[PDB]
Structure formats: C-alpha cells, structure tokens
Amino acid sequence: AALCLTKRSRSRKSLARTHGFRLRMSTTSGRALLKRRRAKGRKILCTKTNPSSGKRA
Amino acid sequence: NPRNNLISGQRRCGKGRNARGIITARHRGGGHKRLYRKIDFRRNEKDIYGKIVTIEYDPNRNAYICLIHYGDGEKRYILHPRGAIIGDTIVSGTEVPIKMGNALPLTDMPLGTAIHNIEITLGRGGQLARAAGAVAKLIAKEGKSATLKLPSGEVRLISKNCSATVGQVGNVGVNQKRLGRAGSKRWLGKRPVVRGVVMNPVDHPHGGGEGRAPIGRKSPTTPWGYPALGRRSRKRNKYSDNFIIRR
Amino acid sequence: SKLQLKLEQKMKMKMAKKIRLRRNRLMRKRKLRKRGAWPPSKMKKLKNV
Amino acid sequence: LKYPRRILDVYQILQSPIITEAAIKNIADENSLLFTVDVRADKKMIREAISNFFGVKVRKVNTLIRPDGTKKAYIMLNKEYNASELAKKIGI
RNA sequence: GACCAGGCCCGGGCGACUGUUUACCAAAAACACAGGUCUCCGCAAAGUCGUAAGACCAUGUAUGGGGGCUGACGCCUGCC
RNA sequence: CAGGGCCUAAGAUCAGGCCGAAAGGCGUAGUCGAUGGACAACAGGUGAAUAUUCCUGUACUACCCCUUGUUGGUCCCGAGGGACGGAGGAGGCUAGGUUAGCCGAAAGAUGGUUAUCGGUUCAAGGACGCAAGGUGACCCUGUUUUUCAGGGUAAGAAGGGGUAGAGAAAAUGCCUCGAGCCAAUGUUCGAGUACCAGGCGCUACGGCGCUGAAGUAACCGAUGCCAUACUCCCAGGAAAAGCUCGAACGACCUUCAACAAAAGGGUACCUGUACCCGAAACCGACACAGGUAGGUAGGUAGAGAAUACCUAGGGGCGCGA
RNA sequence: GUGAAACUAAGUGGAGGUCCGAACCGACUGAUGUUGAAGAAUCAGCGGAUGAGUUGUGGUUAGGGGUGAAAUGCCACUCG
Numbered sequence: 066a067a068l069c070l071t072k073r074s075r076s077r078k079s080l081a082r083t084h085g086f087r088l089r090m091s092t093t094s095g096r097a098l099l100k101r102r103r104a105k106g107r108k109i110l111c112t113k114t115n116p117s118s119g120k121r122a
Numbered sequence: 123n124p125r126n127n128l129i130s131g132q133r134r135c136g137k138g139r140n141a142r143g144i145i146t147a148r149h150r151g152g153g154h155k156r157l158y159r160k161i162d163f164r165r166n167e168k169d170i171y172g173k174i175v176t177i178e179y180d181p182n183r184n185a186y187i188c189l190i191h192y193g194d195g196e197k198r199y200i201l202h203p204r205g206a207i208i209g210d211t212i213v214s215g216t217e218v219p220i221k222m223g224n225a226l227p228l229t230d231m232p233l234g235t236a237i238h239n240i241e242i243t244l245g246r247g248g249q250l251a252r253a254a255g256a257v258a259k260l261i262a263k264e265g266k267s268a269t270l271k272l273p274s275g276e277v278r279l280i281s282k283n284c285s286a287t288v289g290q291v292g293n294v295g296v297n298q299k300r301l302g303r304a305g306s307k308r309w310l311g312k313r314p315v316v317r318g319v320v321m322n323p324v325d326h327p328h329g330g331g332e333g334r335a336p337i338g339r340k341s342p343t344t345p346w347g348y349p350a351l352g353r354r355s356r357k358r359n360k361y362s363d364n365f366i367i368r369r
Numbered sequence: 370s371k372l373q374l375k376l377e378q379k380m381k382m383k384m385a386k387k388i389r390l391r392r393n394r395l396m397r398k399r400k401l402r403k404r405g406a407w408p409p410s411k412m413k414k415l416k417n418v
Numbered sequence: 419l420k421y422p423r424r425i426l427d428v429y430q431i432l433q434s435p436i437i438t439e440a441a442i443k444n445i446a447d448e449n450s451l452l453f454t455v456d457v458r459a460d461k462k463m464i465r466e467a468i469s470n471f472f473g474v475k476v477r478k479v480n481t482l483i484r485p486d487g488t489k490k491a492y493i494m495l496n497k498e499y500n501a502s503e504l505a506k507k508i509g510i
Numbered sequence: 511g512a513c514c515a516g517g518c519c520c521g522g523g524c525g526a527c528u529g530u531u532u533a534c535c536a537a538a539a540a541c542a543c544a545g546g547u548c549u550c551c552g553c554a555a556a557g558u559c560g561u562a563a564g565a566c567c568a569u570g571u572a573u574g575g576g577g578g579c580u581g582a583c584g585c586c587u588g589c590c
Numbered sequence: 591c592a593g594g595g596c597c598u599a600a601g602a603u604c605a606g607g608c609c610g611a612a613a614g615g616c617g618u619a620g621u622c623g624a625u626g627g628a629c630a631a632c633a634g635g636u637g638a639a640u641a642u643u644c645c646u647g648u649a650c651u652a653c654c655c656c657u658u659g660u661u662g663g664u665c666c667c668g669a670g671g672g673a674c675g676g677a678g679g680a681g682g683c684u685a686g687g688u689u690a691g692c693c694g695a696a697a698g699a700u701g702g703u704u705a706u707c708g709g710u711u712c713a714a715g716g717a718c719g720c721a722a723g724g725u726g727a728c729c730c731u732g733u734u735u736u737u738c739a740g741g742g743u744a745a746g747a748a749g750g751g752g753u754a755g756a757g758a759a760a761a762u763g764c765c766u767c768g769a770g771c772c773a774a775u776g777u778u779c780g781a782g783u784a785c786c787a788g789g790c791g792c793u794a795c796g797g798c799g800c801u802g803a804a805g806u807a808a809c810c811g812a813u814g815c816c817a818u819a820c821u822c823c824c825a826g827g828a829a830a831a832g833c834u835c836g837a838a839c840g841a842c843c844u845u846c847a848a849c850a851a852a853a854g855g856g857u858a859c860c861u862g863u864a865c866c867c868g869a870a871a872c873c874g875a876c877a878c879a880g881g882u883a884g885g886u887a888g889g890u891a892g893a894g895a896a897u898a899c900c901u902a903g904g905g906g907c908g909c910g911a
Numbered sequence: 912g913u914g915a916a917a918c919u920a921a922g923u924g925g926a927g928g929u930c931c932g933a934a935c936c937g938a939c940u941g942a943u944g945u946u947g948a949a950g951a952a953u954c955a956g957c958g959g960a961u962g963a964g965u966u967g968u969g970g971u972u973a974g975g976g977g978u979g980a981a982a983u984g985c986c987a988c989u990c991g
Contacts, residue, residue: 066938068949069951069987072987078969079968079969079970
C-alpha cells in the first residue's frame with residue numbers, strides 16, 4: 066500500500082487547470098484572491114505551468 | 123446487422139444520477155456503456171406496409187425491440203408485441219384493420235382490445251404501457267374521451283384521437299428470469315442500497331443505538347422525514363381525468 | 370470482352386489490396402509504437418532480457 | 419497576402435555565432451555553423467536571413483532551445499559552399 | 511533427498527454464500543446480497559437538489575421508478 | 591518520434607434565451623478539452639555531454655513546377671465508413687531458445703582428453719505472389735460428418751453491375767455475372783568494396799591503424815502477428831473529423847483558371863528532446879529497510895513471470911577494526 | 912426407448928460471482944521495531960486473484976455540505 070502522503074506526481078497541466086491563472090480569473094472570488102495577492106506583494110501570484118516551454122534558468 | 127446507423131450514438135453517460143453532481147437518484151453507477159436505441163414511438167408514416175426482420179435486444183428496456191423496414195427506403199425500430207412472426211408485416215394508418223403489431227388512432231377500433239403503446243395526448247412520442255408485458259384494455263368510448271384500463275388496475279378516460287399500437291407486448295418471461303448470480307444487480311448499474319435501521323441519526327430518521335433497533339418513530343419514514351406507508355404523494359388538483367384509482 | 374472486365378476488376382483488387390495492406394501494416398506499426406515496442410534496434414538489443 | 423507567423427524585426431533575428439571547439443567540429447565535419455538567435459524565430463525566417471545577408475544556399479536549419487532562455491541554431495549550408503571559407507571571412 | 515510445495519477429522523453457535531467495513535489498536539456475529547412483503551407513483555409521474563428557471567428520475571412508462579423492513583433455500587408467520 | 595497547426599468523449603465555458611438582492615444559476619448553437627480516433631523512417635557509423643534528431647545508404651508523406659484530357663471547381667448539404675464487449679480454446683507462423691553443419695583459434699604446468707572456446711547478424715520499404723490455416727451455398731455416394739474422390743444447380747461468397755418507386759449516391763425490392771477470397775508468413779532487391787571471430791604495428795598502454803573466414807539446416811516455441819478470425823454468453827459493448835461516393839437548392843472564381851493522374855526534380859510549420867525515472871535527483875521534512883502507470887522477458891531444473899544458481903548488464907548496500 | 916414424448920450412456924465444449932497459486936490488490940495472527948530504517952513499516956506465514964476486480968490519465972459532487980456494501984467512516988498525516 067501507499068502512505069498518508071498527499072501530493073504526488075500529477076501533471077502540472079492539470080494543476081494549472083485548477084489552481085492556474087485561468088480558473089483564478091474566471092470568477093469574482095478568484096480575482097478577489099488576486100486582489101489580496103497583488104495587495105500583499107507576492108512575486109508569484111499563481112502556481113502554473115506553460116504550454117510551450119519549461120523554465121528560463 | 124449491427125451498427126444500423128439508427129442506434130443514434132451519443133447519450134448522457136451511462137445510468138447517470140447527477141443533477142448538479144449531488145446524488146439525487148440514488149444507487150446508480152456501473153455496468154456496460156449501454157448504448158441506447160432510438161426507436162420509432164410515434165409512427166409518422168401511415169398507410170404504408172412494413173415487414174419485421176430482426177428482434178434485437180435493447181439493453182435500455184425490459185422487453186425486446188425489432189427492426190422494421192418499409193416499401194420505401196427507411197429503417198425503424200418498434201416494440202414488437204407477443205406473436206411477432208419473423209417476416210410479418212405491420213402498417214400504421216387510420217383505417218388499417220386490427221392485427222397484432224400495427225398502429226391506429228384510438229377512435230377507429232372496437233372496445234375490449236389488447237393495446238400496449240397508447241398516447242396520453244396528441245403529438246407526443248409514446249407514453250403509457252410500453253414495458254415488457256404491459257397491456258392496456260379498452261372500456262367503451264365517449265364523445266371526445268375513452269375509458270382505458272391500463273396495466274395497474276387503473277382506468278382513465280383519455281383523448282380519443284391518440285395513436286395506439288394494438289397488441290400484447292412481448293417478453294413476458296422476465297417475470298421469472300431470476301437474478302440468482304447475486305452480483306448481476308450490479309451489472310445493471312444499480313449499487314447496493316443501505317437500510318434505515320443500520321444508519322446513524324444524522325443520515326436517516328431511524329438511526330438507532332444498541333442492537334437491531336426497532337423503528338422508533340410513530341411511522342416508518344423516508345430518509346427526508348416523510349412517512350413512507352400510506353401517505354399518498356399526489357397533488358390534490360391536477361387533471362381529474364382518472365375515473366377510479368381501483369387499487 | 371469479359372476477361373478484360375475480369376482484369377479491370379483484378380486491377381481494382383490489386384490497387385485496393387495494396388491500399389488495405391498498406392493501411393494495415395502502418396496501423397500495426399502505430400500499435401507497436403504506442404505500446405513502446407516497435408523499433409527493432411530497441412528489441413534486438415533487448416533480445417537477451 | 420503572404421503573412422509570416424509573426425513579424426519579428428528581421429535585422430535582429432540573428433544575435434551571435436558560437437566559438438566553441440565543437441562548433442569548429444561542426445564546420446570541419448558537417449559543413450554547418452552555429453548561431454545564437456532569439457526565441458521568437460523560425461526555420462523560415464532564419465533560413466531566409468542566411469541566403470540574403472551572406473549569399474549562400476542553406477541546406478537545413480536545426481534549432482533548439484537552451485534553458486538559460488536563448489535559442490541555438492545549427493545551420494547546415496549546401497555542399498557547394500564550404501563553411502570554413504565562409505567562416506574565416508567572419509572571424510571564426 | 512536442496513529451494514519450492516494442502517495438516518486433518520469429529521461436534522456446536524452465528525452469518526446462507528463470493529464480497530464491503532472503522533487509512534494509523536476493532537474485518538466481525540457488523541454492512542451488502544440474491545429472494546420475500548408492505549406502501550407511494552398514469553408521465554405536465556412520484557421522489558431528490560435548488561428562492562426560481564430548471565436538472566436527476568428518464569431520452570425510461572407499473573413485468574417500470576422511489577421508499578420502509580426482512581435477508582438464499584425448506585416449513586410456516588398466530589392473537590389484539 | 592510525442593503533443594499543437596486535425597477531430598471529438600467525460601467535463602468545462604457557454605452568443606443569443608429563461609431565471610435570479612448582487613455575485614451569478616439553468617441551458618442551445620458554437621469553441622476548448624486526450625487518457626481515444628486520423629496522419630509519413632528504418633539500419634549502420636560518429637560522439638567528454640545529442641541521436642528514429644547529425645553523416646551515409648535506401649524509403650515514405652504533404653504541396654508547387656514540368657507533360658494528356660476536362661469545362662466547371664471548392665465549401666455547405668445526402669450517404670457509406672470511421673466504429674469499437676467479455677470469455678474460450680484450436681490452428682498457421684514469426685520473435686527468441688537449443689542442437690547440428692561450417693569457419694577461426696586453442697595445450698589453459700593435474701590421471702586422461704579436444705569431447706574445448708568464440709562467430710554462425712541484418713531493419714523500414716519497393717516489387718511478385720498464399721496452403722497442409724480460416725473462409726466459399728444445398729443434396730447423395732466412400733471414410734469417424736470430417737482432410738479429399740464424383741455429379742448437378744444458375745447465385746450460392748470476396749466482390750462488382752442493371753433497374754423500380756418523389757429516388758444523384760445510399761437504403762429497400764427484383765434480376766444478372768462472378769469459385770474463389772483473406773492475412774500473417776514468405777523469395778528477390780534493399781544487402782555488402784557493411785557487421786563480425788582472429789591475426790597483423792605503436793602505446794599518454796585510455797585505443798587507434800591494415801586485412802578479414804563461415805554467415806546454413808532442423809527440433810522446440812511465444813504472453814507477439816493473423817485476429818475486431820471463428821465459437822459461446824448477456825451484463826448487449828463511445829463520439830466526431832480524416833477517407834470514399836454524390837443530384838437539386840445556397841455563397842465565391844473563371845480560362846491557359848480549376849480538376850484527375852503518369853514518370854522526373856524542388857520545398858520541409860512550433861514545442862519536447864540532457865540527466866534520474868523498481869529512484870541518493872520523483873513523492874514520503876533525510877543520500878529515508880516505504881510508494882510510483884507502461885514496454886523488452888536469456889539458460890538449466892521446473893507446469894510456470896514462483897523458486898535455486900547464472901549469461902548480458904549493473905552492484906558490493908557511505909563508518910570500520 | 913416407444914407411433915412422438917420423459918430420461919440416460921459416451922464424446923465435444925469451456926461456464927463459474929469455482930478451486931491451487933505468481934504479478935497485483937488487501938492487512939488475519941505472531942515476533943521485531945516504539946527518541947523506529949518507517950508520524951504505521953520490516954520479517955515469517957495469510958485472504959482474493961476473470962471479478963460486486965485492480966490501476967494510469969482527464970474529470971465530477973465542497974462544509975446549515977459531499978460521499979458512504981453504513982464504521983461517525985472519508986473529504987490533503989486535521990472531521991460528532
């Protein structure tokens with residue numbers, strides 16, 4: 066059997082369909098969350114992925 | 123001949139139960155895909171003959187269905203009655219004589235006849251008495267109504283200009299086809315139902331304590347509080363078309 | 370006249386035969402790519418396992 | 419009208435050559451040479467910007483992204499043109 | 511001849527049985543089950559979620575769809 | 591090659607439309623949405639880090655140009671098809687394995703012995719074609735009906751083809767011609783002036799350089815192909831595009847414009863490509879005795895993917911005495 | 912075997928919520944381990960293993976709730 070571990074190896078595409086910027090901007094509630102993120106000063110207001118490339122580092 | 127291009131394809135997915143996603147028609151899920159059969163309830167081609175070539179098993183029904191051709195180039199499915207000889211010819215119409223398998227409006231026929239597929243008003247597809255042996259009889263007619271004894275022990279005066287497929291609908295032997303494999307209930311997309319005594323008081327009103335709990339309430343109730351014996355769930359003023367309940 | 374018709378139907382049989390066998394062998398190659406077992410270098414190196 | 423996929427300031431579509439030893443291996447062994455281009459570039463826009471500014475028929479344009487962000491382009495010229503005689507003129 | 515590879519029988523209680531159940535002290539005699547019975551429902555059905563529009567029921571039509579209890583099978587199920 | 595430039599499922603968002611303090615809820619067209627459907631590359635070499643991607647060989651897709659015909663063509667529409675279940679066992683073979691033949695080497699300080707040790711490899715694709723496999727309709731004769739021997743039918747297969755109805759295609763009804771059909775496997779080309787045992791010359795002793803023999807047969811036998819092939823059962827087994835066929839109606843362009851081919855050349859859209867992936871790199875806070883979908887399945891003993899020991903390949907588990 | 916039935920040798924067949932047992936899923940007993948190698952495991956056996964199976968990917972129901980073969984179980988090591 067497995068352990069009581071919660072996060073696993075789910076694709077970042079499906080994590081970006083739920084917690085990404087689009088479903089965060091498709092509601093009044095989620096854009097109010099982005100009022101609180103931009104009002105606080107977070108450098109990364111979402112946790113996303115990209116349809117083209119991985120990372121520029 | 124399977125894949126008739128009349129099986130009509132796309133459906134709502136299986137034996138669904140989701141309105142907004144909440145369980146609202148309980149104990150559903152499982153089984154095959156069960157692709158439906160778009161059959162011809164309201165026969166829109168009157169006074170043209172049509173043979174019977176195939177008795178196909180509809181998984182959506184309790185009975186069978188049958189593939190009927192025409193003299194013109196078409197294919198339909200209809201509910202075949204008891205006594206569907208292979209190759210026999212059925213024909214809808216207004217003055218077509220009475221045969222086990224054809225359709226006609228409810229006026230041009232005698233009284234005291236076995237009919238399965240009747241209409242409750244004009245224009246609809248087909249409503250009443252279309253199960254695997256559901257047979258409706260006719261008591262005598264009236265000016266614009268017709269007292270019809272449908273297979274519940276229930277009579278109903280109805281609009282006389284309604285289509286009706288005369289015949290006793292077949293596959294009666296599902297009264298005795300036992301489900302004795304005991305997991306064949308799950309093959310029909312029917313999950314097991316839990317019982318009200320063995321639940322908790324947050325779930326069912328008969329959530330008990332120690333032991334096999336007696337029913338406790340003054341009446342055996344549903345899981346939403348209404349009494350589940352004798353309490354007729356019917357609006358007091360809808361139609362007043364039924365003569366006597368007779369039940 | 371009839372044998373030339375049998376050669377035209379035979380030529381239809383050769384053309385449709387080459388098309389159907391081409392589609393069948395390419396779809397077998399796609400069925401073996403999709404499982405991850407097609408290229409004979411990756412099988413010939415794994416003949417010992 | 420013949421539109422490209424994106425209008426991308428064609429006199430800046432190439433940035434710099436690559437002067438590693440493996441690039442000279444690609445010159446002497448492949449008749450190819452190495453450029454650094456921006457991410458917004460094509461196998462149709464770079465390939466046109468070689469047959470015009472240089473004057474050489476280019477055979478293929480094998481591009482790749484590099485994880486520091488910028489894009490790397492192996493351009494292989496035709497057999498008729500040596501990359502060594504056209505790379506010493508630039509300074510390789 | 512190594513590794514590997516059924517211990518069995520005689521009684522009784524419960525649950526017919528294969529399954530499911532308290533992730534991290536309870537796998538059970540508990541739940542489910544096939545089967546039985548009562549009861550509601552004639553389609554603009556009942557029932558369920560929602561102020562509503564509406565959706566499941568159901569692109570189905572009482573040999574069907576809910577809900578209560580009991581739990582295969584065999585004998586029955588008394589009185590008020 | 592894997593996704594996007596193609597298509598849809600569950601589902602999401604839903605123009606208008608209905609509803610609702612607000613936010614929004616329901617819902618149709620439409621559009622997204624792969625875990626699916628459609629579509630074209632394999633072998634050898636290179637290489638501190640890349641290989642179906644780079645080099646060389648043979649290919650295949652999708653358009654243009656070059657030659658023959660056509661005056662209509664494209665899209666929307668009408669249709670076929672895509673197109674699908676589970677279980678079962680029997681065939682025909684390939685992949686692998688063993689043995690034998692062939693080729694090269696071998697004295698491995700032991701009583702004998704060569705009985706020993708290594709190779710015996712080749713893909714995609716292009717052509718030709720299939721039986722002792724399945725399918726091909728009915729009856730008699732011989733045999734266990736069966737594999738086959740023999741006669742008749744004018745439809746009785748894969749398939750085409752005519753019509754008839756409002757009937758272009760299709761579907762349905764009628765008539766006619768066709769004894770064959772289907773697919774793995776197979777021979778040749780690709781394909782040897784490749785690969786390969788060995789010896790030959792220097793070591794930065796890490797390998798490079800020249801030359802190169804045989805490269806066949808049989809027995810087993812797949813969980814892989816035929817194969818969505820048959821048989822049985824109920825619990826009855828997605829959709830759309832690509833593809834093919836086609837009249838009317840509807841939008842646009844028309845002659846060196848459009849369409850269909852036959853050889854021959856030209857052209858080749860974005861992203862992913864390292865590395866770990868039965869894990870020290872992922873998830874368990876750890877370089878954690880745990881977990882993680884899928885593919886390849888060698889020898890002997892064994893029914894076997896258990897087990898015991900081993901080839902390939904990889905380790906000796908990061909405190910020792 | 913009788914004019915047909917009822918029924919039985921014998922093959923053929925491969926059904927099963929069949930049996931033994933791997934992968935896989937689950938956790939019955941015992942020991943270890945309790946500042947554990949591990950906030951639930953190791954070792955030795957154990958139950959199912961063609962199904963009411965298991966699992967990947969993309970989804971669905973969201974807290975006066977969901978879901979529950981029903982344990983107050985589970986809903987991110989948290990759930991009256």
